[PDB]
Amino acid sequence: FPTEYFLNTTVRLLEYIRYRDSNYTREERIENLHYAYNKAAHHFAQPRQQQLLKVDPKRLQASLQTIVGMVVYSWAKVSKECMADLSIHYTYTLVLDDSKDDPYPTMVNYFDDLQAGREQAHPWWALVNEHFPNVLRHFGPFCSLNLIRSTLDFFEGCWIEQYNFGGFPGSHDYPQFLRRMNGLGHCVGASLWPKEQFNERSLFLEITSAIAQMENWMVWVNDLMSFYKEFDDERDQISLVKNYVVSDEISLHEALEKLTQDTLHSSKQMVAVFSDKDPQVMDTIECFMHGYVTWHLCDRRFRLSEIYEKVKEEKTEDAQKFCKFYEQAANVGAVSPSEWAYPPVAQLA
Amino acid sequence: MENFPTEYFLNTTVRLLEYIRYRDSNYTREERIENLHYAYNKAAHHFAQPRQQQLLKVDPKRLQASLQTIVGMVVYSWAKVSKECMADLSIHYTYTLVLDDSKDDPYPTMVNYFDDLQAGREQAHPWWALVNEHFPNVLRHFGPFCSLNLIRSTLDFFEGCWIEQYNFGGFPGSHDYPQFLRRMNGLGHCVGASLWPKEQFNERSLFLEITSAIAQMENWMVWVNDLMSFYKEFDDERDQISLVKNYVVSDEISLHEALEKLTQDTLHSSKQMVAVFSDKDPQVMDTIECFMHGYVTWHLCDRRFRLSEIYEKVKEEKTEDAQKFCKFYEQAANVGAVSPSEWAYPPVAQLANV
Numbered sequence: 001f002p003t004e005y006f007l008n009t010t011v012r013l014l015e016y017i018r019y020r021d022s023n024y025t026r027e028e029r030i031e032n033l034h035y036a037y038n039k040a041a042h043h044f045a046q047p048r049q050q051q052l053l054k055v056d057p058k059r060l061q062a063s064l065q066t067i068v069g070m071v072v073y074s075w076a077k078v079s080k081e082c083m084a085d086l087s088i089h090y091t092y093t094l095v096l097d098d099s100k101d102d103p104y105p106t107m108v109n110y111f112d113d114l115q116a117g118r119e120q121a122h123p124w125w126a127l128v129n130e131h132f133p134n135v136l137r138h139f140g141p142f143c144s145l146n147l148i149r150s151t152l153d154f155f156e157g158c159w160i161e162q163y164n165f166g167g168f169p170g171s172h173d174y175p176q177f178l179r180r181m182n183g184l185g186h187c188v189g190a191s192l193w194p195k196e197q198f199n200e201r202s203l204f205l206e207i208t209s210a211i212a213q214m215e216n217w218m219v220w221v222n223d224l225m226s227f228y229k230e231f232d233d234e235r236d237q238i239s240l241v242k243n244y245v246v247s248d249e250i251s252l253h254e255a256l257e258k259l260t261q262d263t264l265h266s267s268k269q270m271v272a273v274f275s276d277k278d279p280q281v282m283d284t285i286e287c288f289m290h291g292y293v294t295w296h297l298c299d300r301r302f303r304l305s306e307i308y309e310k311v312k313e314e315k316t317e318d319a320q321k322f323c324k325f326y327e328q329a330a331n332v333g334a335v336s337p338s339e340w341a342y343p344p345v346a347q348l349a
Numbered sequence: 350m351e352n353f354p355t356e357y358f359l360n361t362t363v364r365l366l367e368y369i370r371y372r373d374s375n376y377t378r379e380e381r382i383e384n385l386h387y388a389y390n391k392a393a394h395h396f397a398q399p400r401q402q403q404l405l406k407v408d409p410k411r412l413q414a415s416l417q418t419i420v421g422m423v424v425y426s427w428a429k430v431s432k433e434c435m436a437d438l439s440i441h442y443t444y445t446l447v448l449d450d451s452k453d454d455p456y457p458t459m460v461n462y463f464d465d466l467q468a469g470r471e472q473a474h475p476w477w478a479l480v481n482e483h484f485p486n487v488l489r490h491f492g493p494f495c496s497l498n499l500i501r502s503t504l505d506f507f508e509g510c511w512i513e514q515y516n517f518g519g520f521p522g523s524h525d526y527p528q529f530l531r532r533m534n535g536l537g538h539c540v541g542a543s544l545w546p547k548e549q550f551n552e553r554s555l556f557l558e559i560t561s562a563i564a565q566m567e568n569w570m571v572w573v574n575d576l577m578s579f580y581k582e583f584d585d586e587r588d589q590i591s592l593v594k595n596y597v598v599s600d601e602i603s604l605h606e607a608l609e610k611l612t613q614d615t616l617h618s619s620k621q622m623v624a625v626f627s628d629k630d631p632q633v634m635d636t637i638e639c640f641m642h643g644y645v646t647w648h649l650c651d652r653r654f655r656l657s658e659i660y661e662k663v664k665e666e667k668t669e670d671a672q673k674f675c676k677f678y679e680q681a682a683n684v685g686a687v688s689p690s691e692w693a694y695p696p697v698a699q700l701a702n703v
Contacts, residue, residue: 104553107493111500115481117469129467141459142511148463149504156497165557167564170624172617177564201456208512209520212529265524272522 001231002253003307007318009224009260014325016267017289024076024287026332032072032083034340039084040064040091043131045348052123055095057346063098065341066301067091073298073333074291077284078138078194085134086191092128093151093184096158099124103159125155135191140200143190146211150187157182166238166246175243179223185215192284206274206281213270214285218292220263225296227256229303297326298333353583354608355659359670361576361612366677368619369641376428376639378684384424384435385692391436392416392443395483397700404475407447409698417693418653419443425650425685426643429636430546434490438543441487444480445503445536448510451476455511477507491545492552498542498563509534516589519599527595531575537567544636558626558633565622566637570644572615577648579608581655649681 013019043049044060053060068087075083106122113120120126128151136144160178167174189211193200200207223240230239231252244255270289274282297304308326311319395401396412407415420439427435458474465472472478480503488496512530519526541563545552552559575592582588596607622641626634648654660678663671 104493111488136463141456145508152501168561168625170621171561172621173568174564209523213525216525269524273520
């Protein structure tokens with residue numbers, strides 16, 4: 001694992017986005033983490049949700065905790081209710097990402113049932129659409145449209161992913177098409193602007209620009225941070241990086257390099273465009289980038305904890321700034337689940 | 350008025366037509382006329398019904414002209430699908446083109462979009478009421494996967510038109526904006542996925558090919574449309590936004606440097622289309638190839654793009670690129686230059702009046 005560059009890329013990333021301390025205290029996090037987890041936990045524990053959502057309890061439990069953490073840490077400026085409803089929604093998506101059930105049969109009459117107002121045949125659709133208003137009530141019409149499309153796109157993305165296809169060699173457009181497809185980019189980018197805080201019309205241009213730019217920043221940062229939990233214990237898996245290799249016929253290094261260039265360029269442009277815009281907008285954007293990063297560093301799912309010791313006692317200009325940031329993370333990001341994730345969904349169910 | 354890069358334009362177009370192998374086909378003029386009239390006739394009767402005439406606010410002449418340009422585009426590019434499929438897709442793409450004529454804020458009509466959708470109540474925006482009501486006639490020709498693609502792309506397109514009412518070319522420095530917008534309103538996945546009727550293709554057996562075609566066709570189709578349109582938009586002080594114009598504003602580069610980017614992308618895209626599908630399933634490569642040829646012919650033949658003006662200005666020039674252009678142009682004209690009196694009749698308005 002080329003930690004040398006993995007650590008260089010990472011440093012520049014936090015430097016570009018202006019990584020630093022927030023007035024978001026550890027106590028405030030625990031307060032939010034628990035509120036979001038608690039509402040979401042009661043939701044998934046209901047009989048109907050338990051029945052239609054075929055998920056291994058331990059998996060549902062772990063997915064819910066990872067998501068609540070992602071939301072509470074990145075959507076730092078929205079209400080607790082908004083954090084909770086968004087946690088339920090993104091937990092549905094992470095659960096669909098892991099499903100192995102063929103969609104085809106249940107999508108045969110999708111449109112006619114949609115148009116007729118009949119419950120969808122695919123159970124995931126039946127639950128998500130029934131719950132969707134709980135999320136949409138926090139946004140104006142434009143932002144709501146963006147969340148709906150993004151989730152529909154994401155559904156197709158998971159469909160395509162079940163084929164574990166990295167694309168034909170020479171199909172240069174496939175990698176990013178698939179990533180964008182299941183990256184929930186416009187869902188994340190639009191869910192950052194609750195109508196109780198932002199006026200969708202007054203800031204139409206700002207929000208639309210955020211969605212456009214945040215879509216790529218978010219997916220790319222997630223790919224870079226996930227390069228470890230993936231390059232290590234893979235599984236014939238496909239990924240943006242593993243697809244660049246197969247489709248653009250390049251080396252794993254050339255690929256990971258291409259990603260690094262985009263993530264940095266994307267970070268650079270985020271700052272340039274929004275630094276002089278509405279302070280509230282910039283603030284939400286900055287809080288998301290930093291929180292999203294804190295989330296990757298802290299959450300076990302990405303095992304960035306292992307990438308610690310191997311460099312905690314070194315003397316580099318990168319591997320040394322790595323811990324500085326890493327520790328700032330833990331200083332407020334390292335929180336024991338026992339402090340918020342309880343009781344277990346299974347117990348409530 | 351500056352100066353249209355005629356030389357450069359001529360060169361790119363010629364390089365374009367070669368990379369895709371622009372050449373004659375067994376699709377005859379008489380066959381085109383049968384399809385043109387068939388597609389137009391069903392669509393014309395469709396838009397002439399009272400409900401459609403009432404909910405679809407469009408100037409009659411504009412609608413007449415839009416339908417004719419769309420029927421031509423579909424008949425020439427979706428050459429391998431049935432007459433019915435050609436007719437139903439003609440209606441769909443005419444709805445999309447017509448929405449571009451509206452200046453009305455969608456906001457008020459989208460406030461309750463999701464709840465009305467989930468509950469099965471007719472949508473408040475008149476465009477959605479007509480489009481969704483007609484959609485099954487288009488979807489019946491495709492399996493579940495391709496259908497999902499058409500539904501998403503049309504939803505993306507609706508948002509794309511919403512965004513365009515702001516005539517926003519992007520914030521200086523917002524590099525991701527241009528392609529975000531062009532992709533939002535390009536209907537790429539609608540086109541790409543509509544090329545595979547279930548009567549001629551098995552969705553599940555060709556999943557990987559279709560998905561790949563969708564991914565690659567999306568970019569080829571919009572970039573080619575941008576390049577072939579570059580001429581008509583060049584002096585259009587009325588049209589303020591486009592992929593190239595937005596590159597200028599968002600990337601902070603010259604129109605020429607922006608046109609260079611579109612060119613590299615279009616040419617590069619064409620080469621990869623051929624390199625990927627040349628050794629794939631026969632029917633797939635045929636549909637793909639015919640779409641690229643039909644699509645290019647359409648641009649060369651439809652008055653909309655005024656390419657006939659570039660032809661005229663250089664039909665006597667002894668330059669190499671020019672020789673090739675006029676030749677290709679003449680090819681297109683030989684099979685695609687058909688008088689509307691031969692297929693587009695009677696007028697939509699006449700049928701609506703009856």
